[PDB]
Amino acid sequence: VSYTIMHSEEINKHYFDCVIKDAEMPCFLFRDLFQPFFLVQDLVTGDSGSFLGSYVLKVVGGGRTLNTIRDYTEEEIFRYNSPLDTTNSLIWKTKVERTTEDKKFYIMSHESPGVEWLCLENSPCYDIIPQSIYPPEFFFKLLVSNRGVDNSTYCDYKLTFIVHIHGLPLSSKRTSFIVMVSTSFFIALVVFYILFCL
Amino acid sequence: YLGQKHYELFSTIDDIVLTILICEVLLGWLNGFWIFWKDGWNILNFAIVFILFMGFFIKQLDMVAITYPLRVLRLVHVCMAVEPLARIIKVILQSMPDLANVMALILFFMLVFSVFGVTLFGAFVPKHFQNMGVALYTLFICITQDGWLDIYTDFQMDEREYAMEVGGAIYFAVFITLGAFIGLNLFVVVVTTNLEQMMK
Amino acid sequence: LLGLQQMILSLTQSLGFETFIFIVVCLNTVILVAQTFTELEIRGEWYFMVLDSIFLSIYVLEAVLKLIALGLEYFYDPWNNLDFFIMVMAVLDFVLLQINSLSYSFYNHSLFRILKVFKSMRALRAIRVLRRLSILTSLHEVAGTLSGSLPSITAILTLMFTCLFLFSVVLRALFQDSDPKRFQNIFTTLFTLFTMLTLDDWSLIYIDNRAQGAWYIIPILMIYIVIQYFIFLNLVIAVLVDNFQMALLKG
Amino acid sequence: EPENVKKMKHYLEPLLKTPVYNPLGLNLTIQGSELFHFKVSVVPGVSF
Amino acid sequence: SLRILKLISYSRGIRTLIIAVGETVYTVASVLTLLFLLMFVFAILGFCLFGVTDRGDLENWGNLASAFFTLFSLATVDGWTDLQEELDKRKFTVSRAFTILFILLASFIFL
Amino acid sequence: SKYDKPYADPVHDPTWRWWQHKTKDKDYFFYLFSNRLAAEGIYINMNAY
């Protein structure tokens, strides 16, 4: 927790929580680069080490609020978390040179630059609307696995946790729509003013 | 080391100067409260003795930080009354209202160019370019034109060759030189403008 | 409707331009001074750029009304030419954001900073078009007397530029293979000349050049510094003093 | 007073009818012209 | 050097220049007295603001001679940046405002 | 059994979440028990569980 928050406060030099603050669950910004750090916890002794190993990160579920998480399929995971999907369905994208077998997913360590979020045309970001005031919120259930990328232990850690993202951006379609409707309505009103002033 | 045998005498001379000041104020009020209230400089002396006596007789957190500058303000007021500094003080107080417009124009041009500043400020090259009032006062430090090579090394090596290291630097540098020259000129010109009022 | 449309445009331009332009550019400057404000953008970033694009749409409507307007004499106002350039850059950046896709870098690149300073130009234009009323006559007269002696100060800054370029050329010529890491190129050379010109750590230049093996460059540097410093500042101070002084001699 | 003797002082000050201080930081200040005689005691219930 | 000053006591042209500039002695003395009064005011103010509390900032707004020299530096352009970095760590946010007000008064007025 | 939360706490020993807001005034509790002015005369220690 503390390392992730302090890296977020040292890379982007600012941080701000959600409107409904939860102590157990903080919130992460869309504009901030996401570089998670992980811990290995031994429950039988007092040590708690840092996970200095490789892993694969991907989003396996999503919801608008809590208790709205829906699981995804194999080709869905391929469409959402892989550079090899031709459709505009990249939830996120990273610049790194190490990839897994068949180049499908990303191999990341603690020296990776971080995660930049995209959530393109075929994602839950596209055609999303607020339900009230304040920016919209989304929840991403995402797992870290250690299946074929580590040769130091004899079994892999499957950490499938959930994360909160607020401040979700708007589609270019939405900005184009509001701009064009503002232009049309204002020229209509000004032309009414001009004609009725004559 | 001096005050351990002087604190009692310091208290006594404080009382003596306070009582002679309030005696002078009462004698001035004898000629009329209206003329003393309707005056340009007796108001300041009245406020000085009022604050000092309220802090003396009634308990106050005014401390040395109020007792001592009020005394030296009275010193300035008294030494103004003897002739050979009065003309210069008079022309200073005549020059201030003409300096007010120059100060206001400088501050307004400062805001309208600090927008261009803060477009390249905040969360990068920070702690003097952020905080949106500290950025303004750091720009004021830079326009006062001394020791900004610490700032020059602060935004040094954005890409190490050109990046914005050329752009933003030349922008705020030419703005600094133009604003500093214009401000220093306008200051000296308001000065000589009000001194031509002095010798007429 | 030809000239008839032009005269209708003149009358309705007076009325509607006054009312609508004043109210919408007041709201534009409100949201734009709320925009910069690097504390409240984190209490935002989602209601900020949408209103920014909405009022940019209002501004492109302003430019559309000016384009269908009287035309050539519109271009004869330098402020209106600045409006046209600002709006060209605004529609350029708006369509650049609108098309998406692309193949170049993004996510707060240098081009994003170029669009941000374009937004700063737009904010300055909004500020300058809300001050049609009550610029105050005192500072109006002060600025009019300040701008009277333009050819003199332009000539003096031209002499400054020539002298500074000559000093930079001779210094860079004399600083070859003399640890030039501070002034390895033309931009850094002219910036260092500016620092010498502005009394900034030229004593530090002397003390870290004394650590080097060259010494005569230090008398050369001080003599150039003192001549340019005294000559330029005396010139500008005297010129502007007399420039306001003859206006003083009048009413 | 840290947030370690808040409850103890708040409990004790009613029923002893005397203000309760915390040691290891105690400082005295006097404005008089005479001989001052002080007694320092430990509150009951914490020693024999 | 006093002997050299006696050498330069000649040159009647310099004597005429000295005569032409010698009616300003009273004026420059009056401005120097104004400078000394403002220096004294802000000297006692700076000692009250940063030297009385005695939580740092010694020999800058502390001892009287050092305080006077730091104020004379602050009334000029030199040494303002390092002094500002020195004062902001003493838990005094309004110290920056007081120092910039002192600059915009003293430096501009005196010069 | 509830320490299977997938979010890391700053400290191990899940009972740290138990005895955190209450350990600021342990001494007071002892004063109430040694002199017998507390509860049913029960002293629930914090380092015993």
UniProtKB/Swiss-Prot annotation, chain A:
Description of how the protein assembles with itself and partners: Component of the CatSper complex or CatSpermasome composed of the core pore-forming members CATSPER1, CATSPER2, CATSPER3 and CATSPER4 as well as auxiliary members CATSPERB, CATSPERG2, CATSPERD, CATSPERE, CATSPERZ, C2CD6/CATSPERT, SLCO6C1, TMEM249, TMEM262 and EFCAB9. HSPA1 may be an additional auxiliary complex member. The core complex members CATSPER1, CATSPER2, CATSPER3 and CATSPER4 form a heterotetrameric channel.
So where does this one cross the membrane? 175-196
Organism of this sequence: Mus musculus (Mouse)
- Which Cys-Cys disulfides exist here? 18-27, 119-125
Annotated gene:
Catsperg2
- According to its UniProt record, which protein family does this protein belong to? Belongs to the CATSPERG family.
Any further remark recorded for this protein: Catsperg2 is absent in sperm from mice lacking Catsper1, suggesting that stable expression requires Catsper1.
What job does this protein perform?
Auxiliary component of the CatSper complex, a complex involved in sperm cell hyperactivation. Sperm cell hyperactivation is needed for sperm motility which is essential late in the preparation of sperm for fertilization.
Q: Where found, per UniProt?
A: Cell projection, Cilium, Flagellum membrane
Which sites carry carbohydrate?
151
What is this protein identified as? Cation channel sperm-associated auxiliary subunit gamma 2
Q: How would you summarize where this protein is expressed among tissues?
A: Testis-specific. Specifically expressed in the principal piece of the sperm tail (at protein level). Expressed in spermatocytes and spermatids within the seminiferous tubule but not in interstitial cells.
Curated annotation (Swiss-Prot), chain B:
Q: Which residues form a coiled coil?
A: none
Q: In which tissues is it expressed?
A: Testis-specific.
Domain of life (superkingdom): Eukaryota
Q: Where are the transmembrane segments?
A: 8-34, 39-62, 66-84, 98-121, 165-192
Q: Which UniProt keywords apply?
A: Calcium, Calcium channel, Calcium transport, Cell membrane, Cell projection, Cilium, Developmental protein, Differentiation, Flagellum, Ion channel, Ion transport, Membrane, Spermatogenesis, Transmembrane, Transmembrane helix, Transport, Voltage-gated channel
Q: Does the keyword Iron apply?
A: no
Function, as annotated: Pore-forming subunit of the CatSper complex, a sperm-specific voltage-gated calcium channel that plays a central role in sperm cell hyperactivation. Controls calcium entry to mediate the hyperactivated motility, a step needed for sperm motility which is essential late in the preparation of sperm for fertilization.
Instruction: Return the similarity comment.
Output: Belongs to the cation channel sperm-associated (TC 1.A.1.19) family.
Protein name according to UniProt:
Cation channel sperm-associated protein 4
- Residues of the whole record sequence present: 92 to 291 of 442
Curated annotation (Swiss-Prot), chain D:
Q: Where in the cell is it found?
A: Cell projection, Cilium, Flagellum membrane
Tissue spec. comment: Testis-specific. Specifically present in the principal piece of sperm tail (at protein level). Specifically expressed in the seminiferous tubules but not in the interstitial cells. Within the tubules, it is expressed in spermatocytes and spermatids, but not in spermatogonia.
Q: Which organism is it from?
A: Mus musculus (Mouse)
What this protein is called in its record is: Cation channel sperm-associated auxiliary subunit beta
Q: What else is known?
A: CatSperb is absent in sperm from mice lacking CatSper1, suggesting that stable expression of CatSperb protein requires CatSper1.
Q: Which residues are glycosylated?
A: 27
* Description of how the protein assembles with itself and partners: Component of the CatSper complex or CatSpermasome composed of the core pore-forming members CATSPER1, CATSPER2, CATSPER3 and CATSPER4 as well as auxiliary members CATSPERB, CATSPERG2, CATSPERD, CATSPERE, CATSPERZ, C2CD6/CATSPERT, SLCO6C1, TMEM249, TMEM262 and EFCAB9. HSPA1 may be an additional auxiliary complex member. The core complex members CATSPER1, CATSPER2, CATSPER3 and CATSPER4 form a heterotetrameric channel.
Q: Which domain of life is it from?
A: Eukaryota
Q: What is the recorded function of this protein according to its Swiss-Prot or TrEMBL entry?
A: Auxiliary component of the CatSper complex, a complex involved in sperm cell hyperactivation. Sperm cell hyperactivation is needed for sperm motility which is essential late in the preparation of sperm for fertilization.
UniProtKB/Swiss-Prot annotation, chain E:
Q: In which tissues is it expressed?
A: Testis-specific.
Q: Which cysteines are joined by disulfide bonds?
A: none
- Phenotype of the disrupted gene, per the record: Mice are normal but males are sterile. Male sterility is due to defects in sperm motility unability to fertilize intact eggs.
Instruction: Give the residue spans that cross the bilayer.
Output: 1-11, 20-46, 94-111
**Compartment annotation:** Cell projection, Cilium, Flagellum membrane
Membrane topology (Cytoplasmic):
12-19
Quick one: signal sequence residues? Answer: none
Which residues are exposed on the Extracellular face of the membrane? Answer: 47-67, 88-93
Intramembrane segments lie at 68-87
Q: What does this protein do?
A: Pore-forming subunit of the CatSper complex, a sperm-specific voltage-gated calcium channel that plays a central role in sperm cell hyperactivation. Controls calcium entry to mediate the hyperactivated motility, a step needed for sperm motility which is essential late in the preparation of sperm for fertilization.
Question: So what family is this one in?
Answer: Belongs to the cation channel sperm-associated (TC 1.A.1.19) family.
Q: How does it assemble?
A: Component of the CatSper complex or CatSpermasome composed of the core pore-forming members CATSPER1, CATSPER2, CATSPER3 and CATSPER4 as well as auxiliary members CATSPERB, CATSPERG2, CATSPERD, CATSPERE, CATSPERZ, C2CD6/CATSPERT, SLCO6C1, TMEM249, TMEM262 and EFCAB9. HSPA1 may be an additional auxiliary complex member. The core complex members CATSPER1, CATSPER2, CATSPER3 and CATSPER4 form a heterotetrameric channel.
How is this protein named in the record? Cation channel sperm-associated protein 3
Give the organism, scientific name.
Mus musculus
